[PDB]
Write a protein that binds this DNA or RNA. Structure first.
Ligand SMILES: [K+]
Ligand SMILES: [K+]
Ligand SMILES: [K+]
Ligand SMILES: [K+]
Ligand SMILES: [K+]
Ligand SMILES: [K+]
Ligand SMILES: [K+]
Ligand SMILES: [K+]
Ligand SMILES: [K+]
Ligand SMILES: [K+]
Ligand SMILES: [K+]
Ligand SMILES: [K+]
Ligand SMILES: [K+]
Ligand SMILES: [K+]
Ligand SMILES: [K+]
Ligand SMILES: [K+]
Ligand SMILES: [K+]
Ligand SMILES: [K+]
Ligand SMILES: [K+]
Ligand SMILES: [K+]
Ligand SMILES: [K+]
Ligand SMILES: [K+]
Ligand SMILES: [K+]
Ligand SMILES: [K+]
Ligand SMILES: [K+]
Ligand SMILES: [K+]
Ligand SMILES: [K+]
Ligand SMILES: [K+]
Ligand SMILES: [K+]
Ligand SMILES: [K+]
Ligand SMILES: [Mg+2]
Ligand SMILES: [Mg+2]
Ligand SMILES: [Mg+2]
Ligand SMILES: [Mg+2]
Ligand SMILES: [Mg+2]
Ligand SMILES: [Mg+2]
Ligand SMILES: [Mg+2]
Ligand SMILES: [Mg+2]
Ligand SMILES: [Mg+2]
Ligand SMILES: [Mg+2]
Ligand SMILES: [Mg+2]
Ligand SMILES: [Mg+2]
Ligand SMILES: [Mg+2]
Ligand SMILES: [Mg+2]
Ligand SMILES: [Mg+2]
Ligand SMILES: [Mg+2]
Ligand SMILES: [Mg+2]
Ligand SMILES: [Mg+2]
Ligand SMILES: [Mg+2]
Ligand SMILES: [Mg+2]
Ligand SMILES: [Mg+2]
Ligand SMILES: [Mg+2]
Ligand SMILES: [Mg+2]
Ligand SMILES: [Mg+2]
Ligand SMILES: [Mg+2]
Ligand SMILES: [Mg+2]
Ligand SMILES: [Mg+2]
Ligand SMILES: [Mg+2]
Ligand SMILES: [Mg+2]
Ligand SMILES: [Mg+2]
Ligand SMILES: [Mg+2]
Ligand SMILES: [Mg+2]
Ligand SMILES: [Mg+2]
Ligand SMILES: [Mg+2]
Ligand SMILES: [Mg+2]
Ligand SMILES: [Mg+2]
Ligand SMILES: [Mg+2]
Ligand SMILES: [Mg+2]
Ligand SMILES: [Mg+2]
Ligand SMILES: [Mg+2]
Ligand SMILES: [Mg+2]
Ligand SMILES: [Mg+2]
Ligand SMILES: [Mg+2]
Ligand SMILES: [Mg+2]
Ligand SMILES: [Mg+2]
Ligand SMILES: [Mg+2]
Ligand SMILES: [Mg+2]
Ligand SMILES: [Mg+2]
Ligand SMILES: [Mg+2]
Ligand SMILES: [Mg+2]
Lengths: 146, 205, 118, 64
RNA sequence: UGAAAUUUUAGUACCUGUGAAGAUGCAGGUUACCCGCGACAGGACGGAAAGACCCCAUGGAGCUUUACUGUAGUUUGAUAU
RNA sequence: GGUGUAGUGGUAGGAGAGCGUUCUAAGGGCGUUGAAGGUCGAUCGUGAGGACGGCUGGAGCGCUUAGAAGUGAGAAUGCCG
RNA sequence: UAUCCGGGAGUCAGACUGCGAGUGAUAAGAUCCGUAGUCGAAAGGGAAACAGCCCAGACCACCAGCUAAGGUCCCAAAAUA
RNA sequence: GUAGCGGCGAGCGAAACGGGAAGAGCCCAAACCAACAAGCUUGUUGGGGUUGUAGGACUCCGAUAUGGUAGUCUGUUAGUAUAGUUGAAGGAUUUGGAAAAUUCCGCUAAAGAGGGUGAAAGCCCCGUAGACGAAAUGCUGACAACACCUAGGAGGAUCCUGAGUACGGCGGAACACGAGAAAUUCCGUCGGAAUCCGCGGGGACCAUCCCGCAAGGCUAAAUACUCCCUAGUGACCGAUAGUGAACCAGUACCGUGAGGGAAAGGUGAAAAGCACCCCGGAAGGGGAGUGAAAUAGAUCCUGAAACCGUGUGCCUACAACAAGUCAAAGCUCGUUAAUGAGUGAUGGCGUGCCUUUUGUAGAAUGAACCGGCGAGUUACGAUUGCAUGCGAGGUUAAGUCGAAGAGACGGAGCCGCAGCGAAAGCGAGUCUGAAUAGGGCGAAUGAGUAUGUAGUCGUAGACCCGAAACCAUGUGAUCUA
């Protein structure tokens, strides 16, 4: 390109709308705020979720549940993703991380049976769904609980 | 692609091949535009400020009582409507620099270089050597190569004499092969690069 | 990037004042009064470009009425007769004939009277 | 600064797979003698935040 | 010798009527040559003061008490010296 | 680009597209043979607005594309003169 | 045209007119609803003047024509039909 | 913005792990030994020792080295700060008062940054690139010297290892944690341990296990800030702006005092600042001069509008006027040459602008006029649209190098690709349920992500102006009691 012939991509940049700059612009005088009231004031408006004094929805509804301190979440992997490897490959958490399939393993890799497996693989993971284990074994592979 | 190689004296050697990944792609106009805008913004210093009513000197007391005087009610002699009062909003020191995805940055650089090559504004010289820095000699070199417009001279690292002899010419902008920017390439109408510099560029990208 | 007032303000206000040339005193001297008057001038001008057509049709009708009476006919009877006689000469031209070409106007009136008789 | 989460709502609702909000039911605390067994049975079941209420509160849960 | 309040621009009539319901300015009619000077104060809902009366604001302040919640002081006990 | 049909009052307000101001970059220009600015003119565009001449003035300023905003005043018993 | 999904609102003082009711005294330019219109946010013609009534919805130009409500002796266009 | 805290409201809000900047570790008390003085211990000095895979004393051995410093107004040396030296290259022609401008030829460049010079200068000047320079006084870095730290192994019989301390009750406070189930830390009051088979912590508490060793001290760097000094920068201001202050500004002025707090820049290239003459008492003018220009004459560049005045082309003394608009004779004049311009007898129509209202010509509000200034902004987040890059992937943050740039590295981390459940947990399902039933939420039925931009929102004063008031320092009994 040439510095004297620059052209942005169509629709990439827009013009800021400036309020209170004459009537014909459509945002003169009141600047789109309307006429009087609380919302027409500088810094006006009520806090989010406020309802003018009616009991807000969150106040109406009850608190529920708790968070388990020892909660364990697993990075999930499916047979479709496993199909990305070749027969006889040794699928490992390190292998998945290097492949970028599982950037964060959380508490460990758990393999699920969402897709259809088609390669014989020796999969090592923290946990396997029973269906996932059946699919891996039925495809001629094996599963080891790391 | 292939670009004619010239010797410093001006005579042409055999052509040399440039990596198609770098000098052979279809340039991306919008990406180039984004890079130019972003770099120009990053050049901004943005040291500018104004004094709001709280920063202006004095202005604590109420100028006169709320009611009775028949005058408009005022709260401080430094209110924005007052002559010498504070400034409503206005500039504040800030930075205008942002960053693009690395892939977009790389694509923009390749696009400008490929654009130069396609337009045949890329002149590759086998080498630029000067026993001592002499602007007259480098100007003669440009004449031999038949370059008379804005030219970006890209030199391999360490070619201090070449860089010195070239820098003072108004139409010449000197950069090292390691430190080249989309803005530099686009500003220059032609790009004069030595073969070592081109090799280093291809290595970098 | 400070943008001081500049000269756009003076340019705009001078345009208004030039529009107001000829007004009475302050109405041509002062911008606020001038602008107020120029706005009313616009309102009146737009209204009068419509009233102008009404006024001239009214003037033509009055003149045609006078001429028709001199020819022994009321305006209403004359126009009814002309419509019956298929004459489409409009009121502007009819008034022109009445004032200038009384002979031609009399011919038109005679045709109208003939049509009415039939 | 970082926008804050409304802690009361965080305790009371759950984000669902489809982006909606799962909520408990009101009138499930006491005074059950005043409610028919059908009412208790059908209030035992969770529900979803209505469209109007969700549009009012979504920004308070952006990063729940 | 030389101010001031006020002041949207004013070539600034009367009656009846109309109108945000009390018109110099609108309608109909009537009266009235142009410019002043000295006087009067009926009108310009005249000037002056973002009405103090009245109501409102989830306003302020001072005061009161067997309003609420506190607390300085006074007093009683335990404990240490 | 043409034809046809239909449509084009508007406050709060939503959408769209533009005018003009200062500055930055690049390109291309103009200036003691007179820039900006001021004033006058019967000029041009659908609008904001744009030129062109005369006079005044005496040194800086347009235009194209893109960019950033202390970017547009007639009212605040606004402030200053 | 309706739905649905999403971005952005403003509105929560209404007025009168006709019709159907309440309250009132079968008073109010009263009050409160239902219903339609208009004003609000609508210029133009008529009703003397006259937001809400009658006719009728201004993108512009014309010194062209035909009509609506309402009118045709003069003010004042049109029948002393 | 998670775990949490919270009239479980408004809101407040971590830490550890991970990635980086920077890195450095050391001394006593005690036991024990020697000396000394008193009055066998008990105090001064010295030695000795410094810890958790327990260390030390003490007893045996063997070593009298090896390394080091966060020391020194100790010298030597180098650099550097505080003055400076040097530093290339142009003449003509045109216009002009004047050349840097125009035109023709040149020349320099490790210097084409910048400023000045009679207008705009690479080559006229100051400079810049580059080279060089310090008597004296600082500062830094080295080198030396001095100074000061620096021992290995084996045994435990005994001895030491911080007391009104830790800890507890009560009352407060700090920990994001508001007494709460409440750890941990700290203050006041009272009570009050153990001591290596010992003691503390791992969020009440106990047990087990693990980790550590309080009640003694010191310790550079990474970090925060800039009254000042030097050199620079700016899509920062350009005289109502920018500091309140471009100028004799915290001045004038105001106040008893604390305190409040202005206005005010521009002749010309050069004063060449108008010799002399005339009117006038002067002021001020008219000539005459200086100057390119004096309508640049010091109230001095430009010189707007309000406001005031002189001259006059047209009109006006029977007229009821929101001042105009439409129609228009007459008169005057001749343009951006346009079916022109000024004025205007007379005729038609016609109650300003704004705000606020159901409704305002309104006898409701605001504006005396003119000029200037004067109101939705930025930062960080959220969300949607549009755009671009990549795409079941997308992407870096801090930080290092770099011109205050781009860029490179940096994959920690974040979003997405799996959901369901309060949770254990299961998983294209899951929850409820006795249920292979039904139903809820999901999948079948796939697009995300980084950035730009715009709309809106949240935290911030959040579009601008405006209270009566509240609180915390101060100044006031020169009036008055
Ligand atoms: K709005
Ligand atoms: K709930
Ligand atoms: K309940
Ligand atoms: K009124
Ligand atoms: K009077
Ligand atoms: K009081
Ligand atoms: K001009
Ligand atoms: K602004
Ligand atoms: K004003
Ligand atoms: K909608
Ligand atoms: K009704
Ligand atoms: K956070
Ligand atoms: K609350
Ligand atoms: K020692
Ligand atoms: K120069
Ligand atoms: K020295
Ligand atoms: K606690
Ligand atoms: K611990
Ligand atoms: K530990
Ligand atoms: K001058
Ligand atoms: K005159
Ligand atoms: K008239
Ligand atoms: K009043
Ligand atoms: K976006
Ligand atoms: K089921
Ligand atoms: K199911
Ligand atoms: K995308
Ligand atoms: K603000
Ligand atoms: K805002
Ligand atoms: K006294
Ligand atoms: Mg923008
Ligand atoms: Mg609007
Ligand atoms: Mg306005
Ligand atoms: Mg308002
Ligand atoms: Mg209201
Ligand atoms: Mg509102
Ligand atoms: Mg209530
Ligand atoms: Mg203040
Ligand atoms: Mg006043
Ligand atoms: Mg200021
Ligand atoms: Mg202005
Ligand atoms: Mg008509
Ligand atoms: Mg229960
Ligand atoms: Mg019931
Ligand atoms: Mg009436
Ligand atoms: Mg009356
Ligand atoms: Mg009138
Ligand atoms: Mg009046
Ligand atoms: Mg009064
Ligand atoms: Mg009041
Ligand atoms: Mg229409
Ligand atoms: Mg300018
Ligand atoms: Mg502004
Ligand atoms: Mg009523
Ligand atoms: Mg309204
Ligand atoms: Mg109407
Ligand atoms: Mg109205
Ligand atoms: Mg007809
Ligand atoms: Mg008639
Ligand atoms: Mg008759
Ligand atoms: Mg251990
Ligand atoms: Mg020199
Ligand atoms: Mg030259
Ligand atoms: Mg606390
Ligand atoms: Mg403890
Ligand atoms: Mg205690
Ligand atoms: Mg524990
Ligand atoms: Mg430190
Ligand atoms: Mg000035
Ligand atoms: Mg100032
Ligand atoms: Mg000042
Ligand atoms: Mg002059
Ligand atoms: Mg002057
Ligand atoms: Mg008469
Ligand atoms: Mg007369
Ligand atoms: Mg009212
Ligand atoms: Mg007033
Ligand atoms: Mg003003
Ligand atoms: Mg005192
Ligand atoms: Mg005294």
């Amino acid at each position: 390109m040439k510095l004297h012939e620059l052209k942005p991509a169509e629709g990439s940049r827009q013009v800021r709308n400036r309020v209170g700059r004459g009537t014909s612009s459509g945002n003169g005088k009141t600047a789109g705020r309307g006429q009087k009231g609380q919302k027409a004031r500088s810094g006006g408006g009520v806090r989010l979720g406020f309802e003018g004094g009616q009991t807000p929805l969150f106040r109406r509804l009850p608190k529920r549940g708790f968070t388990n301190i020892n909660r364990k979440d697993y990075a999930v992997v499916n047979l479709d993703t496993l199909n990305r490897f070749e027969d006889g490959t040794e699928v490992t958490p390190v292998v998945l991380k290097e492949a970028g399939i599982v950037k964060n393993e959380k508490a460990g890799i758990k393999v699920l049976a969402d897709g259809e497996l088609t390669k014989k693989l020796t999969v090592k993971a923290a946990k396997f769904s029973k269906s996932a284990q059946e699919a891996i074994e039925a495809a001629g592979g094996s599963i080891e609980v790391i | 692609p292939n670009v004619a190689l010239f010797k410093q004296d001006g005579t042409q050697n055999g052509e040399i091949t440039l990596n198609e990944e770098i000098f052979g792609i279809e340039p991306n106009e919008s990406v180039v535009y984004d890079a130019i805008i972003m770099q120009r913004a990053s050049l901004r210093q943005g040291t500018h400020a104004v004094k709001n009513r709280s920063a202006v000197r004095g202005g604590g007391r109420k100028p006169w009582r709320q009611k009775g005087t028949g005058r408009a009610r005022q709260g401080s002699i430094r209110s924005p409507q007052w002559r010498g009062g504070g400034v409503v909003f206005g500039p504040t020191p800030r930075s205008y620099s942002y960053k693009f995805p690395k892939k977009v940055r790389r694509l923009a650089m390749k696009s400008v270089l490929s654009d130069k090559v396609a337009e045949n504004n890329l002149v590759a010289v086998e080498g630029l050597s000067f026993d001592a820095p002499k602007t007259k000699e480098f100007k003669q070199v440009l004449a031999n190569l038949s370059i008379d417009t804005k030219v970006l001279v890209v030199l391999e690292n360490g070619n201090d004499f070449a860089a010195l002899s070239a820098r003072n010419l108004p139409n010449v902008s000197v950069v090292t092969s390691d430190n080249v920017s989309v803005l530099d390439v686009v500003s220059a109408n032609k790009v004069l690069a030595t073969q070592t510099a081109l090799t280093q560029i291809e290595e970098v990208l | 990037a400070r943008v001081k007032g500049g000269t756009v303000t003076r340019k705009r206000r001078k345009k208004v004042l030039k529009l107001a040339k000829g007004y009475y005193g302050s109405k041509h001297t002062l911008f606020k009064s001038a602008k107020e008057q120029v706005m009313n001038s616009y309102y009146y001008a737009f209204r009068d470009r419509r009233q102008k057509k009404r006024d001239f049709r009214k003037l033509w009708i009055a003149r045609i009425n006078a001429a028709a009476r001199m020819n022994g006919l009321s305006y209403s009877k004359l126009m009814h007769g002309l419509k019956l006689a298929e004459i489409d000469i409009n009121r502007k031209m009819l008034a022109d004939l009445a004032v200038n070409d009384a002979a031609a106007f009399t011919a038109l009136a005679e045709q109208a009277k003939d049509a009415l008789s039939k | 600064p970082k926008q804050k989460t409304h802690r009361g709502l965080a305790k009371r609702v759950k984000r669902t797979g489809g982006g909606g909000l799962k909520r408990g039911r009101a009138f499930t605390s006491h005074r059950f003698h005043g409610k028919t067994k059908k009412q208790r049975r059908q209030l035992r079941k969770a529900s979803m935040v209505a469209k109007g209420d969700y549009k009012r509160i979504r920004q308070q849960l952006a990063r729940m």
